[PDB]
């Protein structure tokens, strides 16, 4: 970077030189009128070139060489090392008229060289490298660079800042800046609600870290210490990317020169680092489970025993939560979503919370904020996929919606915008609005195929249920009763025959199968799936006044997936030879693939099933091995 | 694109098939309970494959082949041509039990194949190609594709739509859609203020074009005509890219299926085209001049004669405007900016207008909308440059501002955001706030170097002026008077001596030279310029109470550039040997390069110069040869 510094007519100019730049110096303006030629001397650590009309020649420390004074003949001044107290760094120019060889005047330039660099870990190894050339930009991908910031999801201490990103101002120079200079760190007003920066202002009084840049604070004067010095700063993001915010923020340091009272200080030198705030990322069912969170009323005993029995088959831990006055029966599933953030140095799980009425341990970050489509039961994410050559290494988020011209329900714009702005999960809208409750988790899920890197999409299917019931009826099982053991269902005496003879229910369910198939098609298209990747599980629905579906028997597709082990809601289907024909059919689909099924009874405690489930579960999983910053998202 | 269509248990399914998709067909659900195997027949133009566990085999129109009924054995159905009235396109499946070879039941699929494609010119040759595979995306660069929309900068006629982009819905099929289908064109609520679409609703009553999509209209049912048909639509952009709007809009067509009253129609098929609205682009001084616009009071005769004499040296035309009650003296320069838009089919010049108090021919588009930094005298644009390997083929926009921590003036956020959002001119902020008026055009300009592809940056320089005056004084010209012929200046008797002896003015101008040099450095950095690319023109300023500069004599850098011919404000400098020493110095810098200087007197009519200019000029230029859509802007 070339910088303009002029000799001043009949006077000495003193200037700070910042390493990494060089000066072009006009010597012609300072020349007395009538002067013909000039000569120059310079000190040991200043390099001087005479540049005439583009041709540059190096000049010795003390020569007698003379050049013609011309506007197009200038100096180029370079220094390779910072000044110390033993430096006298200078360039002196003498001027001659046509008569004598004795100088008629002279103009000097006295320099103080310092190194100033604002450093960040832009190469993403967790360590702050010296002056990364790319630190002022942010690029995606394996070869991409630029520094990463975590949102802080919780006078300050040193230990409390462990989760933040380091930024170090490295300097080198003599004992003091020359008179009239100061060093200032600053951010834009716009970024002031995106970021915060801490540092110890008075280190001789302690380690106390104070907040010097952020809301209401746009600049901070930093104190210069001579010799080689580093000032350590810690930087936090205040918010995730969103509709109006790309995720990118900038921090600047400038050397400012005092001009005079009432006049602004001049930015002699400025160094800039850029940060991207790490996006919130969701974990699909194929990722290794860590903890299983469940919520149920205190007395649903079968549910708790059977869930505990399931988790004990695995290496997961169980966390049991009970119901709250301000939260729904399903709140652990509907009001909470487990996701994570990651920076090169650190990452942690981060929970999104949307309490029904408003307001899990210290290891978590917590992000807290309308129709039923706003619930997190309506939010899923696929395993990693490749679609038409385009890879989605973190998978794609799935959100239930209604047809564009339908005038039906849709997730709120704020949440939709938030998910889109994370960019790395490239969300897809499905059609959930044919369901009374309206959640994609009522009709679909994903399971890994054990012993491989592959996965299956599981889809609810009414056609599968009707085919099975018609077979069993043909086999002479038409009188087989459902809901055995639910006393509140008994007076209904629902059998396979009674179900198959109900004409309006048949038509309702043909319609719901169209709804499911429309989703099947979008899923195959947007996830790059074929029919080989999909298994259909029998389901059945009843229609409400709005022509929307609610489960006739518990939806088995919404299941706890812990690797090979699947907790599947107990369907209470018709009993053939003292086994539920629905459980037996599902085992026959899944077990040959190495998946182990355990049916979990969440409804017996209520004596009947009206289409609503009173328990919920959510699984916290390990993050992807693939680093998000290695992705190359499409330009938005 | 694969689409799910199921045979229905004991009944015929009728469906529309859209060319470019194919169907996967479950035959197993429709099978009676107890059925073992199936066989199939199909018509001539339907292709059928039996796909079992992934293995697909083609099946003849009438064979006797049987396959085992399995959930994993399905059909794949394909058609290569649209149905006509002579078509009977069908697939019939028969079912057998274990006993007989006579079918126990059958389920059919009756198809009507149509072609539906929403076509745009996505390959950017001005003609609408059939179904461009990339029409649903928009990519920059030489190899980039996707369609371009012009902002409309002005019942409808056919001729009035000449400036819009064409979009054609191409269909092929039999005389009518089967019962319960309709075709609908639609846009999102969000895009509804970005776009508008016209078309003739009732062609049998005339050619009258009506507005069917846009503000308040999100969808339009289009009438289906049989045979090969095209419906022609015209599309206009309503606004330029801006802070919240990328410039991209989408238009959809869907085939919708009627389900039943009270239930939404199902989107059977959807085709999407994307448009980018063309950005507003500025023209730098190197582009060929077309018209020169000037404004002055009616009686400034010297100004008009000399400007006319200048333009007559060129092939440009002169347009003379006079002053208005609602506009400043300089309004043609300050309140108006000439730029252009371009699409493959058409482009036109587009003027930005910001009248001082609020509110050029039919060939122009007109875009109409605070401190002096908001004026267009504060807006410039560089010739094409390459900086550190990064090319800016349309140059870069330059905007004057104040230092970040200064608390000084800045152009309004709205205008700044607008310029940034055009993206193709990648704007740069300079420092203009040291000037009372605060316009970059007071201190800098660009000129081509005749006979080459190169250009120069011209910078005002106070150091150049002082050097020249000190020489002339040394030569014995110290008593040479300025402002000769301005009667209102006479009593001041300003000479070279009086100027050079004024100590505070010397210090003020050293300070202003620092301000100019700070700009020089940013310009060199952001435009990739060296000292070889820059010429310094003498200037001089006086300081006001705010420590800001106003011209002491007319700023020569703000000049009319028509190729080799430069209209330069007459400086009224000191007379040496009956020539202005400022005019002679400037000729000596410029003329050797082939630039022809004509000095234009805009101040004599006022009898004195206080730092304000009462005339203005603006030049309309030919657009760049380089097409904007060929650029590859940095991802924002
Ligand atoms: Ca590093
Ligand atoms: Ca969820
Ligand atoms: Ca074309
Ligand atoms: Ca302008």
CSV table of N, CA, C and O in Angstrom, one decimal, chain A residues 216-254:
chain,number,residue,atom,x,y,z
A,216,UNK,N,-23.9,1.0,22.1
A,216,UNK,CA,-23.6,2.3,22.6
A,216,UNK,C,-22.1,2.6,22.6
A,216,UNK,O,-21.7,3.7,22.9
A,217,UNK,N,-21.2,1.6,22.4
A,217,UNK,CA,-19.8,2.0,22.3
A,217,UNK,C,-19.2,1.6,20.9
A,217,UNK,O,-18.9,0.5,20.6
A,218,UNK,N,-18.9,2.7,20.1
A,218,UNK,CA,-18.4,2.4,18.8
A,218,UNK,C,-16.9,2.5,18.6
A,218,UNK,O,-16.4,2.0,17.6
A,219,UNK,N,-16.2,3.0,19.6
A,219,UNK,CA,-14.7,3.1,19.5
A,219,UNK,C,-14.1,3.0,20.8
A,219,UNK,O,-14.7,3.3,21.8
A,220,UNK,N,-12.8,2.6,20.9
A,220,UNK,CA,-12.1,2.6,22.1
A,220,UNK,C,-10.6,3.0,21.8
A,220,UNK,O,-10.0,2.4,21.0
A,221,UNK,N,-10.1,4.0,22.5
A,221,UNK,CA,-8.7,4.4,22.4
A,221,UNK,C,-7.9,3.3,23.2
A,221,UNK,O,-8.1,3.1,24.3
A,222,UNK,N,-6.9,2.7,22.5
A,222,UNK,CA,-6.1,1.7,23.1
A,222,UNK,C,-4.8,2.3,23.5
A,222,UNK,O,-4.3,3.2,22.8
A,223,UNK,N,-4.2,1.9,24.6
A,223,UNK,CA,-3.0,2.5,25.1
A,223,UNK,C,-1.8,1.8,24.4
A,223,UNK,O,-1.7,0.6,24.3
A,224,UNK,N,-0.8,2.6,23.9
A,224,UNK,CA,0.3,2.1,23.3
A,224,UNK,C,1.5,1.8,24.2
A,224,UNK,O,1.9,2.7,25.0
A,225,UNK,N,1.9,0.5,24.2
A,225,UNK,CA,3.2,0.2,25.0
A,225,UNK,C,4.3,-0.1,24.0
A,225,UNK,O,4.1,-0.7,22.9
A,226,UNK,N,5.5,0.4,24.3
A,226,UNK,CA,6.6,0.3,23.4
A,226,UNK,C,7.2,-1.1,23.3
A,226,UNK,O,6.7,-2.0,24.0
A,227,UNK,N,8.2,-1.3,22.5
A,227,UNK,CA,8.7,-2.7,22.4
A,227,UNK,C,7.7,-3.5,21.6
A,227,UNK,O,6.8,-3.0,21.0
A,228,UNK,N,7.9,-4.8,21.7
A,228,UNK,CA,7.0,-5.7,21.1
A,228,UNK,C,5.8,-6.0,22.1
A,228,UNK,O,6.0,-6.5,23.2
A,229,UNK,N,4.6,-5.7,21.6
A,229,UNK,CA,3.5,-5.8,22.5
A,229,UNK,C,2.3,-6.5,21.8
A,229,UNK,O,2.1,-6.3,20.6
A,230,UNK,N,1.5,-7.1,22.6
A,230,UNK,CA,0.2,-7.7,22.1
A,230,UNK,C,-0.9,-7.3,23.1
A,230,UNK,O,-0.7,-7.5,24.3
A,231,UNK,N,-2.0,-6.8,22.6
A,231,UNK,CA,-3.1,-6.6,23.4
A,231,UNK,C,-4.2,-7.6,23.0
A,231,UNK,O,-4.5,-7.8,21.8
A,232,UNK,N,-4.7,-8.3,24.0
A,232,UNK,CA,-5.6,-9.5,23.8
A,232,UNK,C,-7.0,-9.0,23.9
A,232,UNK,O,-7.4,-8.4,25.0
A,233,UNK,N,-7.9,-9.2,22.9
A,233,UNK,CA,-9.3,-8.9,23.0
A,233,UNK,C,-10.1,-10.2,22.8
A,233,UNK,O,-9.6,-11.1,22.2
A,234,UNK,N,-11.3,-10.2,23.4
A,234,UNK,CA,-12.2,-11.3,23.2
A,234,UNK,C,-13.5,-10.8,22.5
A,234,UNK,O,-14.0,-9.8,23.0
A,235,UNK,N,-13.9,-11.5,21.6
A,235,UNK,CA,-15.0,-11.1,20.7
A,235,UNK,C,-16.2,-12.0,20.8
A,235,UNK,O,-16.0,-13.3,20.6
A,236,UNK,N,-17.4,-11.5,21.0
A,236,UNK,CA,-18.6,-12.4,21.0
A,236,UNK,C,-19.6,-11.9,19.9
A,236,UNK,O,-19.7,-10.7,19.7
A,237,UNK,N,-20.3,-12.8,19.3
A,237,UNK,CA,-21.5,-12.4,18.5
A,237,UNK,C,-22.7,-12.2,19.3
A,237,UNK,O,-22.9,-12.9,20.3
A,238,UNK,N,-23.5,-11.2,19.0
A,238,UNK,CA,-24.7,-11.1,19.8
A,238,UNK,C,-26.0,-11.7,19.2
A,238,UNK,O,-27.0,-11.9,19.8
A,239,UNK,N,-25.9,-12.1,17.9
A,239,UNK,CA,-27.1,-12.6,17.3
A,239,UNK,C,-26.8,-13.5,16.0
A,239,UNK,O,-25.7,-13.3,15.4
A,240,UNK,N,-27.7,-14.3,15.7
A,240,UNK,CA,-27.5,-15.2,14.6
A,240,UNK,C,-27.8,-14.5,13.3
A,240,UNK,O,-28.4,-13.4,13.3
A,241,UNK,N,-27.3,-15.0,12.1
A,241,UNK,CA,-27.8,-14.5,10.9
A,241,UNK,C,-29.3,-14.4,10.8
A,241,UNK,O,-30.0,-15.2,11.5
A,242,UNK,N,-29.8,-13.5,10.0
A,242,UNK,CA,-31.3,-13.4,9.9
A,242,UNK,C,-31.6,-12.7,8.7
A,242,UNK,O,-30.7,-12.4,7.8
A,243,UNK,N,-32.9,-12.3,8.5
A,243,UNK,CA,-33.4,-11.7,7.3
A,243,UNK,C,-32.5,-10.5,6.8
A,243,UNK,O,-32.2,-10.4,5.6
A,244,UNK,N,-32.2,-9.6,7.7
A,244,UNK,CA,-31.5,-8.4,7.4
A,244,UNK,C,-30.0,-8.5,7.6
A,244,UNK,O,-29.3,-7.5,7.4
A,245,UNK,N,-29.5,-9.6,8.1
A,245,UNK,CA,-28.1,-9.7,8.6
A,245,UNK,C,-27.4,-10.9,8.0
A,245,UNK,O,-27.8,-12.1,8.4
A,246,UNK,N,-26.4,-10.7,7.2
A,246,UNK,CA,-25.7,-11.8,6.5
A,246,UNK,C,-24.9,-12.7,7.5
A,246,UNK,O,-24.7,-13.9,7.1
A,247,UNK,N,-24.6,-12.2,8.6
A,247,UNK,CA,-23.7,-12.9,9.5
A,247,UNK,C,-22.3,-12.3,9.6
A,247,UNK,O,-21.5,-12.7,10.4
A,248,UNK,N,-22.0,-11.4,8.7
A,248,UNK,CA,-20.6,-10.9,8.6
A,248,UNK,C,-20.5,-9.6,9.4
A,248,UNK,O,-21.4,-8.7,9.3
A,249,UNK,N,-19.4,-9.4,10.2
A,249,UNK,CA,-19.2,-8.2,10.9
A,249,UNK,C,-17.7,-7.8,10.7
A,249,UNK,O,-16.9,-8.7,10.4
A,250,UNK,N,-17.4,-6.5,11.0
A,250,UNK,CA,-16.0,-6.1,10.8
A,250,UNK,C,-15.6,-5.3,12.0
A,250,UNK,O,-16.3,-4.6,12.7
A,251,UNK,N,-14.3,-5.4,12.3
A,251,UNK,CA,-13.7,-4.6,13.4
A,251,UNK,C,-12.4,-3.9,12.8
A,251,UNK,O,-11.7,-4.5,12.0
A,252,UNK,N,-12.2,-2.7,13.2
A,252,UNK,CA,-11.1,-1.9,12.6
A,252,UNK,C,-10.2,-1.3,13.7
A,252,UNK,O,-10.6,-1.1,14.8
A,253,UNK,N,-8.9,-1.2,13.3
A,253,UNK,CA,-8.0,-0.4,14.2
A,253,UNK,C,-7.4,0.7,13.3
A,253,UNK,O,-7.1,0.4,12.1
A,254,UNK,N,-7.4,1.9,13.7
A,254,UNK,CA,-6.7,3.0,13.0
A,254,UNK,C,-5.7,3.7,13.8
A,254,UNK,O,-5.9,3.9,15.0
